[model samples]
Target chain A: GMRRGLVIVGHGSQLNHYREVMELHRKRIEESGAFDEVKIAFAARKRRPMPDEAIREMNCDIIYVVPLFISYGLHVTEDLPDLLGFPRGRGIKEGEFEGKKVVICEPIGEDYFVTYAILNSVFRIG
Target chain B: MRRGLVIVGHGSQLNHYREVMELHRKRIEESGAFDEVKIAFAARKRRPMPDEAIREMNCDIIYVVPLFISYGLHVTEDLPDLLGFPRGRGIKEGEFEGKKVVICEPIGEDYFVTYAILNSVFRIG
Candidate 1:
């Protein structure tokens, strides 16, 4: 069995609204059973694990981090890499951190499919 | 020549986030669906405040779309107020500062966005 971990990173907040929504997605993806373990990390919330801590605590051979942000902004480009102890950049990269193989992925908003999704939302309005 | 579009979201200190919004703005502009297309923000450094985008826009009808994932405070409360819309309204269609303004729903709550998220995740390594 390949031990793999998946992490969904979000800009956590004290508001239940933000945390609740992210948690819902986290649990749904976890149920998919695509990876041995699925977890979520928050950038600001006190209760949630930080990105660095989440990656370190995950027990897996390889860890993949997917940011749940709508844009490839500072958090995706600089803050996440800085927290993970990886050099700043984007896309898929395999690196060793905390003695575990880590793979950081692009943020979800950059995907072209999302554009269609946004447009669909707009069309529904009219 | 009489319609405008505006995409609103949480702006960022980093240029990349703004760049992404600009990319969408450009794409929407190029589509020629509206006479004008602009991007505004609720936070961070940026020009053309949400209200400003609405007021300054030269069109008979304007549609404002929130580029947010959910209907939190920003979408439900703050945005409507900014666009001079009466409170508790998801979609407002009326005269605002002497122009026709229509406020649309946020992005995240849409079912299509969920599908897109799944698509993005499935492609991940």
Candidate 2:
């Protein structure tokens, strides 16, 4: 009964700060002890690592992927699923790679908190 | 005359059928066999329409731009001009609005055929 945790995925930015935001979220999630484990993945930018590559490397059950993006426009709606080989609108896409079940969560931008965070940052900066 | 070109920015997605491949290359040039120009800008998926905004509303110099992506490695590089807004190694802090500026190009991912052609044409990375 290995209950796997969250896998926060991002578009990945060359800006270390942008990439770090997701890492920070992952670390925070890890500290919460909510699940068995948490990991981070990316689609592009900086590290040049693919999201599927990261997912494939993971060993767990019920891999919940949280996309850390500002919008659910392209990556969330189109690119990501295409990359993961999942059907559209299916949050729980079952894929067998190295004997594990992967489930992708909604993109962070869909979360109200993200909008607040972006607004807050902009307000502070402006 | 040291003409300047503006580059737009956008992100890329993979859909072989759609043929949309976000791309930005040669949209910026100091001077080439084609013309003497420079271009640069950034956005996640589509080139911000700011280029057209400036071009139409605040027309100063006729300009051109290729797409660049905020999430792209080269966004802060090619589109926004290498010397003006430095990306990759560091960042440039300033407002990117004024006049006579070409918007960075949009992400070319939707146009895979174009990507293929450009990749083959420039022998790019």
Candidate 3:
């Protein structure tokens, strides 16, 4: 059994400015050595690829999809599921694609680490 | 006549964090050539300093307290004006902190830039 890994998911931006920010986290995770392999995928906008399709090609068992979004709002709560063919709200779902299981993680914004970082940075510089 | 600038406020983990963030923003503003620098007190967490207490010591014709929260929420809508005194939910007379005037702007989170940056950073291989 090939042990798979983590996939960091994004909404994809048009301005390219967003790419810079996404790269920051990806770099941090890689440097942190938290996962053996880290993969990046986009949901919409330029070179769009759906999650289910991406997962089909992935070779990992423990797939952690970290959705980079602000708040657990509509995108996290709805649109993403419809795009991925998920049943909705269920984190771990049995996929129709070759006995594969996918786990949708909480949005990164939900974590206080992000808030704490911003707050800390603001305080330090402001 | 002292130049006063408002510090879009945020809750701090430590007084130093708040000081650091504000310092960076202040540095940027100062470099931009705006004079009369001052920070508006918005919330209370540690160090026991309240918004009204800080607002009392300022000298400026016009003032704007930039909000640093992701969303305006309760702090912008209510708390800052509450003055650490209970007048229920309305403005206070002469409680303008003697800055001539103070205005509240929306927090940084309303825009997608921050989130977009976050998304970009997470995309690294």
Candidate 4:
């Protein structure tokens, strides 16, 4: 099928700011029209549509999970993968969930673009 | 009258990510923009409490950047309260034990970060 889904993961918080930030990115990505559908999944606190749940609800044949974390820490390396039902130590994984093909990508921190972004932030403060 | 830079974040229990966070602190410190650079966390087991980081910094003025990805309660309320600034403010200027403190907005909401995020996605897709 042609349908594709994207999930932006976050360390859910009770405060609305965490979700708002994730949602902002989701809106931007959605506007790009890269995927047929985009959603957010929180690890804790706000877990309505968890990573697995969000993936399950997608109507697409293929899905991508991107962790919005700043580093490859537990949440990115272990917790998220565990929640998403990945085996272990796999940065990119393809599997079947809810009868849909799913792909989990690396966290954002692993990308060099974040270094540039952090620098941009530092300059903004000056 | 040294200047200090502090990166605030939600620490992890796994502790492997601290190196990545420390790299940012090291980069900022090496930039020579500030006399000292440190990291503080709101969660997990870590040293240098937000108050402790501020108190021990040798800078005349300190800039604290919350490394979070958004402008939620931690940035809008919890961090400011931890730094001893007035409640319900993003940027605060006041004396903490006779040293000046400046709290910046969380990194997640910054305009450039959005671009970075978009870039990260584009690279993967």
Q: Using lDDT, rank the candidates from best to worst.
A: 4, 1, 3, 2
Q: How would you encode candidate 4's per-residue C-alpha lDDT over B1-125 as one tens digit per residue? A: 68777778776655546766787777667777778888887554356678888877788788777777776667777787686677653567678888888777667766555555555446743
Candidate 4 local lDDT, A1-126, one digit each (tens): 488788888886666777787888889878978779999887654476789888877888788777778766667777777887777663667787767888777666545455445555546743
Q: Looking at model 3 chain A, which ten-residue stretch has the lowest summed lDDT? A: A117-126
Docking class of 3: incorrect
Better of 2 and 4 by DockQ: 4
Candidate 3 lDDT, A1-126, residue by residue in tens:
447455666665444534544555556666656555566666554344566656766777666666765344455556666666776662434454456656666555433344333333333332
Runs with alpha carbons beyond 4 Å of true place in candidate 2: A45-49, A56-59, A77-79, A88-98, B1-41, B44-125
Candidate 4's clash total is 3
Compose the digit string of candidate 3's lDDT tens values, residues B1-125: 65333444544433433554355445645554334444444555433234533455455543343433322333434444444333222222233544454343332332233343333334432
lDDT of 2 at A53: 73
lDDT of 2 by residue, A13-72 (tens): 545544555555566557756667767776653343566777676667767666554344
DockQ of 3: 0.05
Give one clash count per candidate, in the order shown.
Answer: 1, 43, 38, 3
Q: Give candidate 4's TM-score.
A: 0.80
DockQ of 1: 0.43
Q: TM-scores of the models, in the given order?
A: 0.78, 0.48, 0.47, 0.80
lDDT of each: 0.72, 0.43, 0.47, 0.72
> What tens-digit string does per-residue lDDT give for candidate 2 at B35-82?
332222244334434344344333344343332223355554554553
Candidate 1 docking quality: incorrect, acceptable, medium or high: acceptable
Higher-TM-score candidate among 1 and 3? 1
The sequence of per-residue lDDT tens digits that candidate 1 reaches over residues A4-120 is 887777775433556666777777767877678877787543446777788877889988777778766777777777777777865666788878888777677766655655565
